[PDB]
Amino acid sequence: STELTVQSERAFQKQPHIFNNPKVKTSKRTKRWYKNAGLGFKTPKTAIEGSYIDKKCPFTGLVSIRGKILTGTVVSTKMHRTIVIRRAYLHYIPKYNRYEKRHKNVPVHVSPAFRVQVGDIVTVGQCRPISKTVRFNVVKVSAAXXXXXXXXXXX
Amino acid sequence: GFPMKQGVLLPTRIKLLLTKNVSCYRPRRDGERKRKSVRGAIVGPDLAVLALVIVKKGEQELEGLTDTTVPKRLGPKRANNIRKFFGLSKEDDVRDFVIRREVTKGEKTYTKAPKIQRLVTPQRLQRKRHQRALKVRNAQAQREAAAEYAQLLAKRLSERKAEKAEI
């Protein structure tokens, strides 16, 4: 999430060790570090172009995408740099031989490299514990805004 | 029967938490502490026995004390402990100056001596020399092996330039 300010905390926001020297005259100002999480998840343009800091950012931070890779629908975007997605599914009951509707709300960290809203079907990858309820990180916004501009007005 | 304990003060009895290697408590398990009663270090009337030490001689002899004498049961067993028990200076062959004890085996008279530890012996020097020798030997060993891997990669690069020139 973030937006603006970037340096907006009591402690300086700097990526670890990524040093740039004031003696060294520069046009880039601050030297930047990035990578790719693997699993064919193309490290998004806005992650390298970006100006934020997020040490929980999978592409420009100090975490690692590994384990399960899941997808789900976005039901919540309120908490700063973290959202809540709802994976639905059907559970097979043999006695009646029928599948019953069920769901789970996974809390997932979302880097300021994305522009997530409620609805955008999204793809996240498991990581380390980053919080009390966070074990995943958004790694591909599959949807968009669900034909939102399509609902407009007249002329 | 409770014991005193230097540096607890009080002419009373206090229950203290005792640990390893400290008066009035010998532990019974690895790091096993125990809270036991103890008597203060301040002499009172409640005492049955008082442990005293003669520090300066009087003007009269004391029966089972000053008068009679009794020897330290043992003698020096380590090397320099002997040498410096007699003040011999490091040379005077410490394999003689060790006290030997006569015990009589009825109609056999036995002379038993300790066992001088920390003595410099032919076998210990043999060992030390073996240590240095082994260390240096494996040192040069690993150096040469390092050189041989270096040459392996060398005439690996050689086949690199050879095959890359081939095309």
Binding site: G38, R66 | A146
Partner: protein, 260 residues
């Protein structure tokens, strides 16, 4: 649960050991060492349950204490020594030389080898990793760590060792078409030349295999051990060479040799 599990309840003990259900409440806990617990074979099970050279484990311990056994060189007086796959058991008395290896029933076979063949070992590398002071090292499956190997060697590449000393000789790379011994699964004991390695990034690489009978099976890049070229292994395979006879064919062969 408070510390190291020092016992072994005889019912938990790996089935390929072949121990009898009744008569006993415990089994030889494999000691720590080169082989994983449930893919090892205690020298007490070997010098007794397979070699019948003993009865009481006490006799086993006595035998071992008289140095009359040695694994890949060193004597080994650990009654429950965790010996296992590709290892070499030497008996100077009896003049017997054994290689611990899988049949096709995925058990452990009483395999006798030459005294000559009993001085080299196959060893799948588990890691080609750089070490301290620059020294590169390969660590093969049997805990063996050998420094200064070959930049042509990568992970899962098998290896022939001097045993007598600790040096790698000719190494067999992991390519399509290399004679492969299966170490784990219910396709273990089998052998079959490699067909094709299903990749799957960070998700257990499947290994497609076809033996010498035109039969095919898959496994994973874990249970797969390389041992040569088609028809051309590097060690002495046992009587069956991992072809896995079906049940009816087994009914046939064991009743094929019928006339007394």
């Amino acid at each position: 649960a408070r510390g190291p599990k020092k016992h072994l309840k005889r019912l938990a003990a790996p089935h390929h050991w072949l121990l009898d259900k009744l008569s006993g409440c415990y089994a030889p806990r494999p000691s720590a060492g080169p082989h994983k617990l449930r893919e090892s074979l205690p020298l007490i099970v070997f010098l007794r349950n397979r070699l019948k050279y003993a009865l009481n484990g006490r006799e086993v311990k006595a035998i071992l204490m008289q140095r009359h056994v040695k694994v890949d060189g060193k004597v080994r007086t650990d009654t429950t020594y965790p010996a296992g796959f590709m290892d070499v058991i030497t008996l100077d008395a009896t003049n017997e030389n054994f290689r611990l290896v899988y049949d096709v029933k995925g058990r452990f076979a009483v395999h006798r080898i030459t005294d000559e063949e009993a001085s080299y070992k196959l060893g799948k590398v588990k890691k080609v990793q750089l070490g301290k002071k620059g020294v590169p090292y390969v660590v093969t499956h049997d805990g063996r760590t050998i420094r200064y190997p070959d930049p042509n060697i990568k992970v899962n590449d098998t290896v022939k060792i001097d045993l007598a000393s600790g040096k790698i000789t000719d190494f067999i790379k992991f390519d399509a078409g290399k004679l492969v011994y299966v170490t784990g699964g219910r396709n273990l004991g089998r052998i079959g030349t490699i067909v094709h390695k299903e990749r799957h990034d960070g998700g257990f690489d499947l290994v497609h295999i076809k033996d010498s009978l035109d039969n095919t099976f898959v496994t994973r890049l874990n249970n797969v051990f390389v041992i040569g070229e088609q028809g051309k292994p590097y060690i002495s395979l046992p009587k069956g060479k991992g072809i896995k006879l079906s049940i009816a064919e087994e009914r046939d062969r064991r009743r094929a040799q019928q006339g007394l």
